[PDB]
Amino acid sequence: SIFDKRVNYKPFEYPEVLQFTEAINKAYWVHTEVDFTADTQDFHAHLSLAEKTAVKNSLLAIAQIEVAVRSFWGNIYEHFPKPEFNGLGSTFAECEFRHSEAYSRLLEVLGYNDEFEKLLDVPVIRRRVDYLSNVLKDTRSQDNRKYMVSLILFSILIENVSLFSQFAILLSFTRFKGYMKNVSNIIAWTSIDEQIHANGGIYIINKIRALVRETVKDSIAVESDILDWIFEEGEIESIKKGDLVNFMKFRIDESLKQIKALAWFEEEVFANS
Amino acid sequence: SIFDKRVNYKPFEYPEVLQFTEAINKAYWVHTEVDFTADTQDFHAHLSLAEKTAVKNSLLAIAQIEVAVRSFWGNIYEHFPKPEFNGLGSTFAECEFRHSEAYSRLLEVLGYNDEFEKLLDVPVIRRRVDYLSNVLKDTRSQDNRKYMVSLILFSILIENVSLFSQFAILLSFTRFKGYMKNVSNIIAWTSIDEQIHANGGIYIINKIREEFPDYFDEETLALVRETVKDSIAVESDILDWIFEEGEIESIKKGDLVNFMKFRIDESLKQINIPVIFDVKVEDYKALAWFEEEVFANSL
Ligand SMILES: [Mn+2]
Ligand SMILES: [Mn+2]
Numbered sequence: 225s226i227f228d229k230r231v232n233y234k235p236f237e238y239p240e241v242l243q244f245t246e247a248i249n250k251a252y253w254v255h256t257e258v259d260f261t262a263d264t265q266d267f268h269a270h271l272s273l274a275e276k277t278a279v280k281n282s283l284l285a286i287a288q289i290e291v292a293v294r295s296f297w298g299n300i301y302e303h304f305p306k307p308e309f310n311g312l313g314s315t316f317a318e319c320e321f322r323h324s325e326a327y328s329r330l331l332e333v334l335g336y337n338d339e340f341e342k343l344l345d346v347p348v349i350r351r352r353v354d355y356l357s358n359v360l361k362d363t364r365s366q367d368n369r370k371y372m373v374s375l376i377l378f379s380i381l382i383e384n385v386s387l388f389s390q391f392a393i394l395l396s397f398t399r400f401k402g403y404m405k406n407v408s409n410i411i412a413w414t415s416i417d418e419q420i421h422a423n424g425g426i427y428i429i430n431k432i433r434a435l436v437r438e439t440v441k442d443s444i445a446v447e448s449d450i451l452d453w454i455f456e457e458g459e460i461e462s463i464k465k466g467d468l469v470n471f472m473k474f475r476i477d478e479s480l481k482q483i484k485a486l487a488w489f490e491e492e493v494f495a496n497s
Numbered sequence: 498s499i500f501d502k503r504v505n506y507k508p509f510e511y512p513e514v515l516q517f518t519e520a521i522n523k524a525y526w527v528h529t530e531v532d533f534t535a536d537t538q539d540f541h542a543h544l545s546l547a548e549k550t551a552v553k554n555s556l557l558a559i560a561q562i563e564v565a566v567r568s569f570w571g572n573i574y575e576h577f578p579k580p581e582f583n584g585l586g587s588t589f590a591e592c593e594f595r596h597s598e599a600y601s602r603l604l605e606v607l608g609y610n611d612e613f614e615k616l617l618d619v620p621v622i623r624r625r626v627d628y629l630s631n632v633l634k635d636t637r638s639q640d641n642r643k644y645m646v647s648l649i650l651f652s653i654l655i656e657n658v659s660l661f662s663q664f665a666i667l668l669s670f671t672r673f674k675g676y677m678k679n680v681s682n683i684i685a686w687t688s689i690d691e692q693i694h695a696n697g698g699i700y701i702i703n704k705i706r707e708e709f710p711d712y713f714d715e716e717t718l719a720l721v722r723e724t725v726k727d728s729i730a731v732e733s734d735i736l737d738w739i740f741e742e743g744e745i746e747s748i749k750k751g752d753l754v755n756f757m758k759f760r761i762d763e764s765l766k767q768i769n770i771p772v773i774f775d776v777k778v779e780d781y782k783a784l785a786w787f788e789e790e791v792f793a794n795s796l
């Protein structure tokens with residue numbers, strides 16, 4: 225089975241894994257390629273306080289997940305002891321380190337390290353953490369039935385929902401205003417990697433073939449409250465909170481179908497890619 | 498300390514980690530960037546039986562270490578619970594998967610999968626596997642002193658000497674004969690990566706020496722020096738199996754033994770361990786072309 229340890233390296237029992245690692249390989253990128261001087265000039269002079277807050281809080285919401293020690297992918301070999309899944313996890317774990325460094329830099333160049341330190345003082349961020357830490361309680365569980373339960377939640381929200389909300393907000397400043405072009409480059413490259421991390425999760429879930437889908441509907445409530453915190457200074461004009469909820473509803477449905485004025489998102493991602 | 502868990506991502510307690518990860522980032526490469534058709538033609542037409550056997554057995558010995566599930570670097574966060582070392586471990590773990598795929602491919606192109614499956618039937622390889630087992634027996638130990646011993650032997654053997662003998666053998670065909678230039682691209686890129694891995698391990702060893710100088714007692718230094726001296730005996734016997742069909746004009750075994758001994762000594766100096774062999778400039782300059790040949794085959 226997939227939970228049994230195969231000793232020989234090749235042939236790969238699941239050769240489709242290379243499609244996900246090679247996609248990460250071809251999309252390889254680091255934050256040191258990008259210069260944020262123009263974005264700081266656009267930020268300082270041409271963005272309203274409600275627009276500054278939307279950029280600040282969206283990046284803080286992204287950093288809450290991205291700026292952390294990521295250990296799920298780097299340990300799937302402990303649960304799927306195959307050489308191809310150790311490489312799948314290795315490639316995703318490295319990519320998450322490039323992500324954590326990129327949003328650690330953005331927090332530094334925009335001067336938001338202090339707010340990131342005390343981020344749990346925000347009640348709604350504290351609500352997403354209490355949510356996330358509990359629903360993913362069995363990511364390290366030796367029980368192979370509730371570890372699967374973790375990979376479902378990990379792939380459709382951590383990789384598909386809990387971040388693409390803030391990706392579209394930041395990309396809207398480049399789409400409709402032509403601002404934050406370099407930050408949107410980091411955002412476009414990140415969302416591409418998270419799309420591959422989601423498909424890799426979806427791919428595995430289909431290979432292991434109630435508690436799930438009404439656990440994930442609980443996140444739409446907390447993710448909607450996060451948008452209230454992101455737009456606490458007022459709704460900006462490039463995007464609206466109501467459309468982002470439907471964008472969140474669209475992505476969850478297509479995630480489960482394989483196991484909208486925000487249709488421009490995919491087009492905007494490849495333009496800034 | 499380095500063994501204590503830190504929850505906050507930054508500031509980094511060990512910011513020099515970024516020097517090693519960025520080096521891997523800048524030297525990033527995948528084997529699909531290279532094609533080996535030209536090398537199969539030089540192998541088929543312009544290589545003797547002695548040179549064929551040296552190329553095949555060297556790559557078999559490399560694949561013996563590289564084509565496997567590598568798990569040491571990807572789990573260094575279990576012993577150094579810092580966000581820095583989880584990123585350092587991930588960056589190195591992904592790097593080994595690019596290596597495992599690269600030499601998996603070289604075995605496939607040149608048609609050596611059957612001999613790699615039966616590689617354990619070679620007695621000198623079984624001597625290396627049992628020897629490497631004691632070099633890795635404490636890689637999961639929760640004893641920080643036992644795990645530090647495995648970390649020292651991992652960086653100076655698996656990452657810095659156990660493969661560089663075969664690396665120089667393959668590069669010698671490109672420098673002196675002008676053959677196997679695509680294979681030399683993989684070798685040079687891999688040798689750069691393993692150098693960063695060994696230097697990254699030396700950095701962690703020295704940082705443990707800073708915070709815990711009592712861990713470097715007389716017993717640890719004696720066991721490491723004796724285990725290391727046992728390596729050159731097994732690796733020199735590997736050199737006999739690599740040239741089991743005759744001496745080749747590209748390089749000599751005597752230079753390769755002096756090459757490994759010098760690299761081992763340079764490794765011990767960086768972590769303040771007494772030199773074992775003390776190779777003279779009379780001997781280790783015969784393979785001094787290895788560094789520049791790696792850089793020439795890297796661009
Ligand atoms: Mn990420
Ligand atoms: Mn991800």
Ligand SMILES: [Mn+2]
Pocket residue numbers: 563592593596691
């Ligand atoms: Mn390697």
Ligand SMILES: [Mn+2]
Pocket residue numbers: 593655656690691694
């Ligand atoms: Mn290595």
